[PDB]
Structures are given as structure tokens and as C-alpha cells.
From a paper:
Like all other RTKs, the architecture of dROS1 is composed of an extracellular region (ECR), a single-pass transmembrane domain (TM), and an intracellular kinase domain (KD). Here we show, the extracellular region of dROS1 adopts a folded-over conformation stabilized by an N-terminal domain comprised of two disulfide stapled helical hairpins.
The C-terminal domains starting from the fifth FNIII domain to the sixth, including the intervening YWTD-C, were not observed in the map. Interestingly, the model reveals that rather than having a linear arrangement of domains, the N-terminal region adopts a folded-over conformation stabilized by an interaction of an N-terminal cysteine-rich region with the second propeller (YWTD-B) and fourth FNIII domain. The domain is comprised of two disulfide stapled helical hairpins that associate with one another through hydrophobic interactions. The two helical hairpins generate two loops (capping loops 1 and 2) which stabilize the N-terminal ECR compacted fold. Our structure, of dROS1’s N-terminal ECR—being compact rather than linear, suggests that the bulky ECR could physically keep the kinase domain at distance and prevent oligomerization and signaling in the absence of ligand binding.
Residue numbers in the entry: 215 to 357, 377 to 755, 764 to 1289
The structure:
């Protein structure tokens, strides 16, 4: 069925190959020494060879047509390729819809049988038993690297016991890798084996992943963690060890398995701490994860009772003002004849927001030096809310998002719900907040910085965000008292007068240890104020300032309140309690992209902690300094916003190691980030070509700006395209197909007007004027001349990625497993590096000819390793330059040298980013985002600003003169076929390929000398048909055909 294909391809391609030996078949020619006969022999012996599966090269040995039947090898190999494709279609059409399964598990009957596969038997001969294959296992991760087993014993049974070290307690998915063909995306798979979990029994190997280590409060460090990627046995707890940096105070806490946070208590303030997260299971402990954090620096008690900050004392009808300094003023502010509900507080403006039981909003701007102020009503709007009667009960002020939060009362009979609104300062922009509820509101306080609104009803302490999206419970007991959340400590101080507990519940509803409430020094309290660690307790008719140390309930200071014996609420009048912004979290993940004279610096916003909501205030001013390592010219650029910035006008002779700081809205110096490397002047202008998968080619600058699209369109999934000259270029597409295109004059005919299938990569040599492409069908390489269009074959086998060094003619080929250089002599063929069948395959390689260096890519199990090697020293300085972290695969052949920049450029599989590795600083991989007009990209080249040099005629050895072909004086059985040495204009070493035809026998010789010593000739005076093709290490000359007779 495929022999017809062989014959048709042979007759089509009979004259397409102009062999170097000077053999030429015309149509209807029955010459047996020529291409068609060898190809027919190849596809007649191809099946016989496949009986025992011998190599085509050794199957094509000819007893009369030495040394190599290259058309026979080609015919055999394409026969194998077509046969394998046909078998692929057959195996896909018959079944291929059956997965390897595990129905019976390792028993407890004393048989320790590991993974077993009992999978149906639909297989033909040959491919069943003698055919080897590989099995790879899939890692089950929901948010890894796929490896292949190295040990499995099985046969026609297909029950493969695996001694591979599978790590216990990790879910696996198995599958069969069936190798059909040589292309990466030309392989079929077995769909999926049902997920199987290997039994447990080992210590944990992964330390717990710590995701948040906030410095909550001054002495209440908190830590967030979860299971590590690996478990190794069921987990029953964790080991938390905290060690001080200046002391021996080490606290070790143990936590059951199910928990996602932990909080320590009673720590020293203003000192750096470290935390030891340990993952522990039944059989033992595991690794240790370390974290560095310093707790918030507290506010010391300061002048004992002399601080100038005041407090607002509130009674039934009073807004009394009092300051804590000794003999402080007790100036009364304002009186009302109705019952007062609560107050608010503004720091940016000395203005109060009073509200009685009837919802009368009275502005009470604290006049500078005068208590008397207008008490005008601030009648609110209700058209946008509802037409019913609405009387607010509790209110509070937001000092960052200038607003006024209220607790509303609906007029519903027997199911009167309560609601929150967010009006404007004058109270006109009514806004729906959250959902309705039936329990009455007793106190509303809003935390502006971290973005939360806290209220307490008779039962719980519901917490909400500024808008009303997330509502989360905090605590539910009987009749909670007063709480005084402060924005710079992340903890709430909840008082209970009946139980006398005075809790310290944290923001997430966890850490909840009560404190010793100070007993009265003579009753009940309804509020308090927090002056640092000291507690300000407003007793009735007496204000005590107690240093809260437990049993230290002694009044450090007292201020009579004989004008108000029924105080119920106190608020500390300190500017720190309403700060404009909070801790200056340093920017993280600094990234620098550099070009010729411009740079694109991108760095991420400081990460938020879970205690602050989405609507939390995060307004950030930025600044960035740039200094030279050598010149030390430092300059900082302020008034910058956004996570992305573009540097402009870098000065020459400079390195730009860079580091970025974040400036708070107040204007206080932030925390410096880590330094980052840079890059110096390459030369100047460059031109990168981006090949989009849709076929659009886009030219950009070094960074990707200055886009200049091209008017012409390429085919689907193109590869790097090689310029024959300034006009015509070759390229290879994703499915193994090449097209010849013309950039400027499309009407001009290409050297070959039909695209060629099954091609891997193409390269052009400027000195030889010939273009080479890797032919997977023939498993060899061919010669193409853009002018003549003739084909000549080069005996290089399994050639996948090609590159030619034009200086000395050595041809460098990269097979899938081994790398070597093919020269004019067998002794010169030196393998630079060889991989085995398990570590991976060569992905791409580029040749550096000015530096006499060779580079290549080695695809691995889960990472790609860069290498180097000298061409003059065989395998002497192999280096592991960069092992990429993560499963990032580079497109084959996409690796192209960057002579301006002196680096290597390859494109990842995604096609959205490119990676740069520089010779001077290999340890830094530079990202390059693909332009969106070209994303995703399939090929990236750097066009040399220098024009491609013209073809050099100085080579191309002159045709051997027919009159110069003579047989010099020797015996008829030992004589030299001597011709005048073909002279190349560059004095290059000329080699001669000799075709000798005598009778029905053909003798061929590859000679580095202008003479051929012929021995063992059967008879004297024989008529010898001599064909001489003078060849240099780069090009082949015209063939000379001469007939001679042996002289004495």
C-alpha cells in the first residue's frame, strides 16, 4: 500500500536531486546504477528489513554499488515514517479508547504487590513485546512537573511492577507514553489512569508554607500558615517555636491539625522576633520554616498625667470636655433638653457630630478658643432611601473617606429592620450599605485605615466592610460592653462590666484571652479610653487613670466631674487615633527591564494583610533612586504613581543598579527594597522580529516599543525565518512545513514554488551561498541553491537542528540525544556533549564563531539547563549556566544568539515572554513581554543592522579540466588516476568525489588528494568512465566526465 507512494515519490523526485557523482537519468531510462533503481530496491527491502527491524543504512548495503546507497536509505526511512503514520491512524480508529486501570489493590495476605495494571489486549505482533516505551506519572496539583519512571518490569501481560521511589502520601496519575514518530507534537497518549494515592509512612518533607506573619499590636504577634505541598502522612498538629533575637525567652506552642492561624501573647515590644513553623505527623517531625517580623513599637506612658491630649466626657445631656493634664480644664461645651444618643469625632476639622434620640444632627464645630458654636440642624435626605420615617440611632465619622456612617431605624410594624447609610459631610449623598437586620444598634465605630466598620448589638459584634460585601461574626455573648478599636494596633478592647472580663478579641475572631479588669477603688463602667498600655477608666463622679498591670487599680490622677455624675462614654482626643495612613509596607517583587537608553521598571504594590478589607485605604506615593556602581551618580525621582514606570535618558558609561521605596501620603521615608542588577550600553539600535501564531510578523525595538508592522502575512505558527539575501527568506512552521516568501517583490518566483513537508529547521551559509534544512523524512540534510534549485545530500544522520560555521566549513548538527560537529574528515568529528535517554533531549543550539564557542539547550525532566563548550577543546568546560525554576519549556530552535547584547535569546512555550541570559551576568534572567499585537509569539530573531555579506565566489573550486584527467605511470593493477588539482581562488583544501564505471560495476572514492590509487582492478586496459566532482569543505564544483584506458 505504501510501495506505490515510494514509486510515485521516486518518479516525482528522480530529477529533483542532482547527485554529486554526475549520475543523470532521463525519462524512460533503464540504467540500473541510478536513483530510481536504488529507491525501488529500498522500498522493496523496507518491509523485509522491518521483519527483524534492522537499520536502513545496514539494510541498504550493496555488493556492487559501494559505499552508501543514500537514495535507498531515504526510501527506507520515509517508508518507515509512512508506515508508522498508517499504524497511528489504524490504532486510533480501531480502539485507543481504553485506559490502564487498577481494580485489585495490594492485599494484607503477606503480598506486598505495588501498582498493578490490568489493561485490555488489542495489539498486533512486533509492536506488542519487542517494542519498548516509557511511562510517565502526572502530579495532581490544583493550583506540577511531570516525570517518567525509570524502573518497571512488564511484558505482554502489561502488568508493570515499579521499584521507582514514589514518595508516600501524594496523589498520582499514571499513563502510557507510546512513542510514534520523532516530532514532539506528533505523539499519541493513553488518556488517563484513575487517580491513585500511594500509601503513607514517611516524615514530612516540605516545611509549612507561611503566607502572612503580621506584627499585630505591640505584643501579640500573629502568624498565618497552611499544609505544605507535601504531607507524608496524616497531619495531627504543628510545632510553633518563637525565639527572641536578643534573649533566651523561647515559647513553644502546639496546635491541632485543623487551624489556619495562631497568635502569641505577652511579648516584648519593639524587638525583632523569629518564628519556627514545623509540620509534624504521627511518626515524627518535619522541616522548619523561618519568618522574620518585629512587633509594633508601643507608645510608652509618657509624662504620667501631664499629656496635653484631652478626652470627651459624655453624660445623659452633656458633651463635657476635659484634658488629662494636672488641674486640667473642665470646660463644658453644649447642653440639650433631650436625651443624647452618641457623638462622632473629626480630627481634620475641629467639628463634632451630635445626635439625640430623635435623630437631630447638630453641627458642633469646636471654635478655636471658644466653646459656643452654632447648633444648626443637618436634616438628612430620604428620597433615595425610602418614603417611610427614618430616625437614626447610632452614628460615627470616617476621617479618610470623608463621610458619615449611620445606623437607621425602619418604620416597619413588629419587624422593624435597621440599616446603614453612608452620607456626605452635609448629609446628602445617601448610599445603601449592607443588609437589614432586626437587632437594635448600640454603638457604631468605623476603622478608616484598614477599612472596617464595627458595631455591637445586644447579642453579637458583627463586622462589615466599608461597602457591605463581607459580613463576618466576631463574638457572641450576653450584653457586651464598650469597645475602642484603634487603627494602628489591629486589636479591639471589648469591655464587659457584668462579667468583669475586658476581653482583647482580635480582628479575625480568634485570639480572645481576657484580662484582669481592675476592681473599683472604693460600681460599673460603660466605656473607657486607651492611653497606650494604660487604661483610662471613667468611673461615676471620679476619673481614674490606672496603669493596667492587673492588681494595680490605683488612681494615678483624678479629675472631679461634679458637674456631671453620670458619665457613660469617653473618647480620647489624640491626633494619633485618626491617622492619615499606616505602616509603610515596602514594595515587593522589583523587576527591571532595560533597553538602549530607556528602561521599563515594574514593581508590585505592597501586599495587603487579611485584617484589612478590599476598600482599605492604600494611597501610596512612590520614589525611586538610581545610582551607578562605578560612577556613583545617584538621583531620586519622586511624585510617581502606579506600579509601572519608564526610565528615560540613561547616561552612557554607567550601570544602573536600582531600588525603589514607597512614600506614605504624609511624606515619611518608607522602607528600602532589595537592590537589583542592570545592564550597560550594548551598541545602539536593534531590530527584533516577532512571529505571531496567527502568522503576523511584527518588528519592534529592544523593549518592544516603536512598533513597525509588516504589510505581508505568513502562514500559521511560523518559526525563525532566515534571510538568503535582503529580499527572499526561508522559514519553518510549527507542523514541519517550510515556505519560501519574498518580502519586497512577491511576484518574483521563489527557487522552489511548492512548499516542502516534514522539515525541522533551516539555515543559510553566507560564504557558500547554500541553504540547509533538516529533513525528518530522510533523517538527513540536503543542499539547496536559491538560483539553480538543485539538491545534494550530505551524509549527516538524525540531524534535527543545524548551524554552519562558515570560517572552516565544519558542519554542526544537533541530534535528539547527542551533539557533534561534522567536518571533512572522520577524525575531526568530536562529540561536544551527549545525553542519555532519561535526562531529556536537546531543545535548541546556536553557534558563536567570533568567540569560538558553542551553546545549546538541554530539555530536562522539569527544567532547562544552559551549557557552553569550546570548539578547540573537546568537552572541556561543560557548565550548568541556568537551571530555570518551574516548568517553562522553550520553543525548539527558538534559541538565537544576540551579538549586539552578547546574550542568548529563546522564547518560552506560552509565547508571551522571552528570557535573556547574558554572558557577563548569567545568574539574572531578564523578562521580555511579547507585544499584544503579536501575542502569542512563535519565533523571535534579532536582525543584524549590518547587511548580510554577499556570496563569495573566491571558493567554488574550478571544474577539473577534462584534458588534465590522466592515469600516471603505474602497473595496471596499481596506478594513480591523476588530474590537475582543482584550484579554489581562496586556496581552500579541495576534496574530490570520484565515480568509476567499468562494465556493470561501479567504484566510488572520496579523496582529499588530486590522485586516486586504484588497486585490485580485475583486468588491464579496461575502459574506465571517470566522473570527478571537485568539492571544497563548503561547496561542490562542476563534474567532469572523462574516459581513459590504463597505461603502463
Amino acid at each position: 500500500r505504501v510501495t506505490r507512494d515510494c514509486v510515485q515519490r521516486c518518479i516525482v523526485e528522480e530529477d529533483l536531486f542532482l547527485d554529486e557523482f554526475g549520475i543523470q537519468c532521463e525519462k524512460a531510462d533503464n540504467g540500473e546504477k541510478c536513483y530510481k533503481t536504488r529507491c525501488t530496491k529500498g522500498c522493496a527491502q523496507w518491509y523485509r528489513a522491518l521483519k527483524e527491524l534492522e537499520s536502513c543504512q545496514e539494510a541498504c548495503l550493496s555488493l556492487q554499488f559501494y559505499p552508501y546507497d543514500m537514495p535507498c536509505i531515504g526510501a527506507c526511512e520515509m517508508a518507515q515514517r509512512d508506515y508508522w503514520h498508517l499504524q497511528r491512524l489504524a490504532i486510533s480508529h480501531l480502539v485507543e479508547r481504553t485506559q490502564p486501570q487498577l481494580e485489585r489493590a495490594p492485599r494484607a495476605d503477606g503480598q506486598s504487590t505495588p501498582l498493578t495494571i490490568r489493561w485490555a489486549m488489542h495489539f498486533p505482533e512486533h509492536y506488542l513485546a519487542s517494542r519498548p516505551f516509557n511511562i510517565q506519572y502526572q502530579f495532581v496539583d490544583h493550583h506540577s512537573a511531570w516525570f517518567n519512571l525509570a524502573d518497571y518490569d512488564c511484558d505482554e501481560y502489561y502488568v508493570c511492577e515499579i521499584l521507582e521511589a514514589l514518595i508516600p502520601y501524594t496523589q498520582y496519575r499514571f499513563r502510557f507514553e507510546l512513542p510514534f514518530g520523532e516530532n514532539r507534537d506528533e505523539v499519541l497518549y493513553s488518556p488517563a489512569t484513575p487517580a491513585y494515592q500511594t500509601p503513607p509512612e514517611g516524615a514530612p518533607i516540605s516545611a509549612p508554607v507561611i503566607e502572612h506573619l503580621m506584627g499585630l499590636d505591640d505584643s501579640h504577634l500573629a502568624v498565618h500558615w497552611h499544609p505544605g505541598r507535601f504531607t507524608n502522612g496524616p497531619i495531627e498538629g504543628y510545632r510553633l517555636r518563637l525565639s527572641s533575637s536578643e534573649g533566651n525567652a523561647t515559647s513553644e506552642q502546639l496546635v491541632p491539625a485543623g487551624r489556619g492561624s495562631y497568635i502569641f501573647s505577652q511579648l516584648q515590644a519593639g524587638t525583632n522576633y523569629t518564628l519556627a513553623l514545623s509540620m509534624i505527623n504521627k511518626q515524627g517531625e518535619g522541616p522548619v520554616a523561618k519568618g522574620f517580623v518585629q512587633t509594633h513599637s508601643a507608645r510608652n506612658e509618657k509624662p504620667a498625667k501631664d499629656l496635653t491630649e484631652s478626652v470627651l466626657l459624655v453624660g445623659r445631656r452633656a458633651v463635657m470636655w476635659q484634658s488629662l493634664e494636672p488641674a486640667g480644664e473642665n470646660s463644658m461645651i453644649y447642653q440639650s433638653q433631650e436625651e443624647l444618643a452618641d457623638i462622632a469625632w473629626s480630627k481634620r476639622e475641629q467639628q463634632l457630630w451630635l445626635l439625640n434620640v430623635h435623630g437631630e444632627l447638630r453641627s458642633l464645630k469646636f471654635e478655636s478658643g471658644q466653646m459656643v458654636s452654632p447648633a444648626q440642624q443637618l436634616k438628612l435626605d430620604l428620597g433615595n432611601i425610602s418614603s417611610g420615617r427614618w430616625v437614626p440611632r447610632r452614628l460615627s465619622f470616617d476621617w479618610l473617606h470623608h463621610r458619615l456612617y449611620f445606623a437607621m431605624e425602619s418604620p416597619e410594624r413588629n419587624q422593624s429592620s435597621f440599616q446603614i447609610i453612608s452620607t456626605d459631610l452635609l448629609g446628602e449623598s445617601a448610599q445603601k450599605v449592607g443588609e437589614s437586620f432586626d437587632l437594635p444598634v448600640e454603638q457604631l465605630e468605623v476603622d478608616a485605615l484598614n477599612g472596617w466598620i464595627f458595631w455591637r448589638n445586644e447579642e453579637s459584634l458583627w463586622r462589615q466592610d466599608l461597602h457591605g460585601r463581607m459580613i463576618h461574626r466576631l463574638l457572641r455573648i450576653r450584653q457586651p460592653g464598650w469597645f475602642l478599636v484603634q487603627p494602628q494596633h489591629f486589636i479591639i478592647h471589648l469591655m464587659l462590666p457584668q462579667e468583669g472580663k475586658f476581653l482583647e478579641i482580635s480582628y479575625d475572631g480568634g485570639f480572645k484571652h481576657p484580662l484582669p479588669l481592675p476592681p473599683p477603688s472604693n460600681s460599673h463602667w460603660q466605656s473607657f479610653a486607651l492611653l497606650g498600655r494604660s487604661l483610662l477608666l471613667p468611673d461615676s463622679g471620679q476619673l481614674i487613670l490606672v496603669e493596667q498591670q492587673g492588681q494595680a487599680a490605683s488612681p494615678s490622677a483624678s479629675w472631679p466631674l461634679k458637674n456631671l455624675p453620670d458619665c457613660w462614654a469617653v473618647i480620647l482626643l489624640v491626633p494619633e487615633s485618626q491617622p492619615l495612613t499606616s505602616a509603610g509596607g515596602k514594595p515587593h517583587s522589583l523587576k527591571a527591564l532595560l533597553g538602549a537608553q530607556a528602561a521599563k521598571i515594574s514593581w508590585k504594590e505592597p501586599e495587603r494583610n487579611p485584617y484589612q478589607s478590599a476598600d482599605a485605604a492604600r494611597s501610596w506615593s512612590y520614589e525611586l533612586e538610581v545610582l551607578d556602581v562605578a560612577s556613583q551618580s545617584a538621583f531620586s525621582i519622586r511624585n510617581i504613581r502606579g506600579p509601572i514606570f519608564g526610565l528615560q535618558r540613561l547616561q552612557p558609561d554607567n550601570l544602573y543598579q536600582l531600588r525603589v521605596r514607597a512614600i506614605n501620603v504624609d511624606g515619611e521615608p518608607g522602607e528600602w527594597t532589595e537592590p537589583l542588577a542592570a545592564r550597560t550600553w550594548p551598541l545602539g539600535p536593534h531590530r527584533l522580529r516577532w512571529a505571531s501564531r496567527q502568522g503576523s510578523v511584527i518588528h519592534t525595538n529592544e523593549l518592544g516599543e516603536g512598533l513597525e508592522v509588516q504589510q505581508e502575512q505568513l502562514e500559521r505558527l511560523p518559526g525563525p525565518m532566515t534571510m538568503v539575501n535582503e529580499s527572499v527568506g526561508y522559514y519553518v512552521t510549527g507542523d514541519g512545513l517550510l515556505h519560501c516568501i519574498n518580502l519586497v517583490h512577491s511576484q518574483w518566483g521563489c527557487p522552489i514554488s511548492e512548499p516542502l513537508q516534514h522539515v525541522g529547521s533551516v539555515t543559510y551559509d553566507w560564504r557558500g551561498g547554500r541553504v540547509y534544512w533538516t529533513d525528518l523524512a530522510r533523517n538527513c540534510v540536503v543542499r539547496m541553491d536559491p538560483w539553480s534549485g538543485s539538491r545534494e545530500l550530505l551524509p549527516v544522520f538524525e540531524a534535527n537542528f543545524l548551524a554552519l560555521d562558515p570560517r572552516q566549513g565544519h558542519l554542526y548538527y544537533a541530534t535528539s540525544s547527542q551533539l557533534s560537529r561534522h567536518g571533512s574528515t572522520p577524525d575531526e568529528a568530536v562529540t561536544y556533549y551527549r545525553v542519555n535517554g532519561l535526562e531529556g533531549s536537546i531543545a535548541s543550539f546556536v553557534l558563536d564563531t567570533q568567540q569560538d564557542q558553542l551553546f545549546w539547550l538541554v530539555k530536562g525532566s522539569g527544567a532547562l539547563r544552559l551549557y557552553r563548550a569550546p570548539l578547540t577543546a573537546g568537552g572541556d568546560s561543560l557548565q550548568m549556566i541556568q537551571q530555570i525554576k518551574g516548568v517553562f519549556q522553550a520553543v525548539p530552535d527558538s534559541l538565537q544568539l544576540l551579538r549586539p547584547l552578547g546574550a542568548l535569546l529563546w522564547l518560552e512555550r506560552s509565547g508571551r515572554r522571552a528570557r535573556l541570559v547574558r554572558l557577563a551576568a548569567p545568574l539574572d534572567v531578564m523578562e521580555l513581554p511579547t507585544p499584544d499585537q503579536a501575542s502569542p509569539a512563535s519565533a523571535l530573531q534579532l536582525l543584524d543592522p549590518q547587511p548580510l555579506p554577499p556570496r563569495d565566489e573566491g571558493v567554488i573550486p574550478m571544474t577539473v579540466l577534462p584534458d588534465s584527467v590522466r592515469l600516471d605511470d603505474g602497473h595496471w593493477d596499481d596506478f594513480h588516476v591523476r588530474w590537475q588539482p582543482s584550484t579554489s581562488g581562496g586556496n581552500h583544501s579541495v576534496s574530490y568525489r570520484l565515480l568509476l564505471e567499468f562494465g556493470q560495476r561501479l567504484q566510488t572514492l572520496d579523496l582529499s588528494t588530486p590522485f586516486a590509487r586504484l588497486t585490485q582492478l580485475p583486468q588491464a586496459q579496461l575502459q574506465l568512465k571517470i566522473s570527478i566532482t571537485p568539492r571544497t569543505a563548503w561547496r561542490s564544483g562542476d563534474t567532469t566526465r572523462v574516459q581513459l584506458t590504463t597505461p603502463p
